[model samples]
Target: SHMESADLRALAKHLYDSYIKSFPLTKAKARAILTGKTTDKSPFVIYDMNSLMMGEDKEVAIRIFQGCQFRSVEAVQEITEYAKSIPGFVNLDLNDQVTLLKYGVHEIIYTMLASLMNKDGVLISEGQGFMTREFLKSLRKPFGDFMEPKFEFAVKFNALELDDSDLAIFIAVIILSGDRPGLLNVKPIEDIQDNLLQALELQLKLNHPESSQLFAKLLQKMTDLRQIVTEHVQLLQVIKKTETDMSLHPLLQEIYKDLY
Candidate 1:
């Protein structure tokens, strides 16, 4: 079963608290722009992947997650750790560190996916290097026998795995950068794209002013990023349905009985 809605809510709150500490102005501005409050917790509640995937009001889930996914601390930490540890990198000023961290992490993530297309494959590990066979079993759909062909598997499994948590973090970066007219090229791991498409479909249903605004911004970022790589794609053209605005978080909690 997927993680519970409450768990996602907790995660969102945690992200909010942590994010504000490091970026108060940005957080405040985002809240004001979307929710008419500078410190409301509503935005954070949208990070639950479970809620978006199975909730009654899918639009809410899509908007919240799509708008804020990449900004998640866990995702940020994962990318930054990789960037900081890469060999042969020169000591950088703060701005350069951030730039390298962003670009470097993106490259590394894509590279990891690309490498999985090779023969040797990759290894998936757990705490203290303890291999969790159960987790491995669960992950076999995409990663295959091992983390080998990770990109291939991920690309295939993307649609099944996308949720509000990932969506929120992905779009948050777009909103933050203010990069317009096509600046960021977001390449989803194969399996991940499938789930992303599903989530994106739900996201388009939200037609309220706030939701539409967020979607527009995200589309702009997507356009910019695609242009950066000369990838001509109107990703939004893939959606099959679009509905009006409706809150889905509550329904998400209901669907996941285990949600706190």
Candidate 2:
């Protein structure tokens, strides 16, 4: 079934609960901030500060790079420079900045897809890092034949020599393959995709009607890669179940247990 706004809210709540359960000691500290029991330190202090800074009513001074249909470039540059003068964001890391932009844009995509536009509405977290590997392995067990060609195609496409804008696809391909985040620094594909996406998103902020022809192509390629990963994830689950079932043959059990 399509996930409604209510469904996402519920999922987010459950996830937060799980986080708390995993670290129960943090609870008292959190409560102390809420109840004003102590002003020395607490996660609640950070949370409350974040709420004030990022609340809906707060005026966000985001620098739009690409989609602006505004006045002169100089005027835009002046405003951007002035906005950056504000505290709290003077030295943000590039990855952290990209993450923030991703959140803003992802919200738009999430809302648009809520009409059941796509097959899945799972949050992006499920598709990032190790979770992606576990999901892909599950798919390979049952649907290897169905998915191998598409997976291979994406990998090969990503390996090609492409500009920074198009090379973002390679990052995803590597992540889908065997390379983790740390290994990415050593891989030579470069970090063009992250910077490119950020630039394109900022460009969109200048105008009401957005034309992202180049960025759209990049997104389409990434979407294709994600489709293959999604198929593999389903297969991985089946493989896991087969191994768990004790009714399987002794030899099969040995193979499953010993296999990487």
Candidate 3:
């Protein structure tokens, strides 16, 4: 019933704005907005590739690992904030809200990460640095393979060129999905979700009008994200036993614990 392009654009812009607010850092060099945040966990300092991290360079690997985990805590917070900003999201049962974040956030974060990446690597340290795939691969074994799927996904994902507006609605669709394992009351969620497709498609038409099947292409990307997250969780399970001293953020740790 609601097919107005004006309002559809309005909603999409709101979502894009909300998402950018939650995730402020970008990969732009001079174009990047600066944040002087000095947290306990510092951003990944760009390094010489040959220095290596332990054994040869195990310590660097640990910091990179821990730093990435620190970043996840921030990423998960962004996902939580983004979901809470959705109009109908807060009305759901508290348990269900938690459930949605647990299952959905990783996929959303990975999708948004495509924005910060290029074919060879992603930017880090407030856009002051790049983490090359070769360096990550140098870690070998689990740590090296850990990011491989995400890198693969990012390369394919960036090809779609979904500016933040498209991503915002797509992300909302992901978060509000009723199909996750523990959604207690599916009907209301489905009802809330049902109407958004029109707006998403409408917005995409304005943004990518010349492109055919942009909607279906986006749907395929969603499936790709799901696959990436599954592999991610499986890898995390392996890391749990292998890297006993690694301190995963407690909230993420709890979510990972329940995955299997």
Candidate 4:
């Protein structure tokens, strides 16, 4: 039998708390880093570089690049762990699990990106590292173009002002999506997704009594995230072609290489 609505809500809340606690950096710290208010006085250092630069100062560029890479990897790992903690997630066959992670991880990451973004843009770690859309376009080639679409989606999604609990259920919805290619048991996955979506709708109704459109708005955001993920994959292909010396984390490389 399916879980009751009250049970589902309790599960969602429990899972949400776990997810938030697992993150290495708090949203406040991330904002402080972006705002240049961090009190740590140590000079930022660039780890590895081979001539590619993200901005005018090479060191700053390196810091931003490294920070982006670090955050990307950490987000993926944390999200994967969070997925595993979901009630039925580990019961899926291993191949189906891997497939879901391959296709859905970026979408989930970008959903989290909404929390870090504002109308202006996202921030990276560097000298005045605010990544406005215009500034992103000014970047050289693949590096500059890589994140623009994500920012475009994120800024609009951020405008919705979803709180942490909303994002948690939303991410669960993304992970359980049966639409991803190569799902061996689409029906079961879809059933789980449907239940999660219903739970989210109920939660939203209770939490935001006056906002009748919030549920619909979140559904549209998922559509927008899918488009952004498609563009992001294309950008990864370009990066592979033009940036031979650059290294991607092993997990990310697997994700990019996994066709379908």
lDDT of 3 at 119: 68
Clashing pairs in 4: none
Off by over 4 Å in 3: 1-3, 26-57, 244-260
Candidate 1 residue-wise lDDT, 120-146, digit = tens: 222211110111223333332222222
The runs of at least 3 residues in candidate 1 whose Cα sits more than 4 Å from the true structure, single-residue gaps closed, are: 1-90, 117-247, 258-260
Q: Give per-residue CA lDDT, model 4, range 57-129, as digits (tens).
A: 4234444545676778878888888888877888888888888888888888787776666666664443234
Model 4: ten consecutive residues of lowest lDDT: 42-51
Which tens-of-lDDT digit does each residue in 100-203 have in candidate 3?
A: 88889888878877777766666664555557777776675677878767788888877877776787788888888788897898887776666567678888
lDDT over C-alpha atoms for residue 86 of model 4: 76
Give Cα distance to truth, residue 140, candidate 4, Å: 1.8
- Find the number of clashing residue pairs for candidate 3: 4
TM-score of every candidate relative to the true structure: 0.25, 0.26, 0.81, 0.76
Best by the lDDT measure: 3
Model 1 C-alpha lDDT versus the unseen true structure = 0.34
